[PDB]
Amino acid sequence: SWEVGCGAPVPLVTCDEQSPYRTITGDCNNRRSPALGAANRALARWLPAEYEDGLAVPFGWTQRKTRNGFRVPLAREVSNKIVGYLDEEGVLDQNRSLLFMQWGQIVDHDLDFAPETELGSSEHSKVQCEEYCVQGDECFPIMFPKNDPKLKTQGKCMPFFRAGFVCPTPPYQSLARDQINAVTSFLDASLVYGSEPSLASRLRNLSSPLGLMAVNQEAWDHGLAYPPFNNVKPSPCEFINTTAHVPCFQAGDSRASEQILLATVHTLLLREHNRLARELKRLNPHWDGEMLYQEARKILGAFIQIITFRDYLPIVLGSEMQKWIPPYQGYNNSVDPRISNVFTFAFRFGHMEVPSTVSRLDENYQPWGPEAELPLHTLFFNTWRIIKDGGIDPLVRGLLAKNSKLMNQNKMVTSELRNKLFQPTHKVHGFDLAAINLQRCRDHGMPGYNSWRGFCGLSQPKTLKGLQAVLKNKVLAKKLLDLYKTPDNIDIWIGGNAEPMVERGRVGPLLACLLGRQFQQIRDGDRFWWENPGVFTEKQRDSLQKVSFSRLICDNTHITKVPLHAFQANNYPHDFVDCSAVDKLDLSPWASREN
Ligand code: HEM
Ligand SMILES: *[C@@H]1O[C@H](CO)[C@@H](O[C@@H]2O[C@H](CO)[C@@H](O)[C@H](O)[C@H]2NC(C)=O)[C@H](O)[C@H]1NC(C)=O
Ligand SMILES: *[C@@H]1O[C@H](CO)[C@@H](O)[C@H](O)[C@H]1NC(C)=O
């Protein structure tokens, strides 16, 4: 009831009534409420935020302050006692490729980003949080538990800064704190093009009217494009090897270079766009740059939606797919297309799917070079291994023929992430992605596990044995009740991820509910969904149905043997076929001649 229209937004945004393209910012999608789904607004609250003080202070902020009559355990302790494991044998997913992991991260990055508010120019509390571990305002450091190895080697904390929040971006008053989504809620390739007109154009090739995306001129991949460098300094991709002096790449999403396989997939995504703007030229040489760009962008956005919705989600959601995501019925303007705050946690299930190492594979899909396989941690913010060691193709082969990690209740998150995560301002390959996830739940005012079980029409355990029966695991359940002392207090990230996988999928009931709703809402709520009548011609929509990730690979690399189904486990040379066995993206229906 308070501040019904609050915010310090992207202000002067008006709308074209019959514009055939999405805005960059995702604005003007919904007509009755054109800011719905747009970047740089609040994340949607499916449930009222729960803060220590009901307003903004995170649970665990204040010693003496309990949640339902109990102290919440330290995030790094939940990490250590529950999330970690030593043995990487037996952890691989026998029927999911490493690409399965990778698409997840892509899709996710297109949907949401809640950037930390550090927001200082020449600032003392930057290094002050890291150095001295002094909690305060936006500094909310992850403290070590007693007898934690990182005490011996790193200090007293890992640093952590609270997420951005709307309206008063510096202080706060009388409505609960709400974190920002810096990207568009729609599945619109915002990670290739940007979610700011400012970025969107700094990414374009405006030097020649072919509507191409700007490429790299310093370096090449057998005459294939690289994303341009991001010439901002301090660059972390330079920080990881000062000798190579190779910076991070520049993409529509800022996180592209966090790891080499993410960078890799961003590169396939750039080329597909350029490849598409070239073909449109040949068939429509009368069209200008802008339209070529837009029609390419339009084509790529559909491509991501099909792949995600036809190929990705059925094998994440499995049995719960149809329940939550009925086949398409058309655009409904009453659907909230906004990504919700809990989804930015639910989708972090992908964290448990990341394995310990990355391989590079030659044309016989054999260990490319002597150091073919590398540990994941040496590949954070590492572009130098792409430009100075083989291109994209060997890695794109790694994605096809190696396996995602399997989630496992006794082996959750690998140490490459749980202990050896590199973050940009800091220095050591020494952080804990699991600790962070949990600190973030609290920072974001997340309701606890039972609220969400409640929300999803599932039983709400109150006892050890109850939890045992739901998790189908005595020991896990025990360690959790020992830490959290009531399921009501269990952080949703751990809680949802602890539940056994549903038949034919890769998440448990609760997550499939959360994920399920969200994806349903983003498709049903999108005036520009590829299948929404009048978005494409029926002719255009029949060429669209035949895209594949395999074909994306074939059209954009020099790989000539691919699986038919890229997300399932594929073994070479058995499950591999020559590229010409594979449907293409016919673009005949896009030719629009003068008469
Ligand atoms: C090796 C691969 C990955 C690395 C190195 C990585 C790292 C990170 C980091 C550092 C964050 C920020 C956490 C925070 O500040 O609170 C994050 C957030 C996140 N991760 Fe990952 N991640 C990886 C893979 C994935 C995958 C495969 C998925 C999904 C399947 C995923 C889903 C998410 C989501 C949804 C967020 C929150 C984004 C937001 O809304 O701000 N991540 N990841
Ligand atoms: C930094 O990157 C450089 C490449 O620019 C790596 O140096 C190369 O190492 C391999 C291993 O034998 C050689 O094939 C090259 O001849 C080396 N080049 C140069 C210029 O030294 C180096 O290993 C990287 N170091 C780190 C710590 O990442
Ligand atoms: C823009 O396109 C022209 C014409 O194809 C090309 O020569 C040039 O390298 C491009 N510039 C950038 C920055 O991508």
Ligand SMILES: *[C@@H]1O[C@H](CO)[C@@H](O)[C@H](O)[C@H]1NC(C)=O
């Ligand atoms: C792999 O994944 C899907 C998901 O159930 C399924 O259609 C297929 O049977 C599985 N393949 C194998 C070899 O188990």
Ligand SMILES: Nc1ccc(C(=O)n2ccnc2)cc1
């Ligand atoms: N799911 C991701 C979260 C964060 C990052 C990341 O830490 N940065 C840092 C700079 N750019 C991305 C990457 C992926």
Ligand SMILES: [Ca+2]
């Ligand atoms: Ca988006």
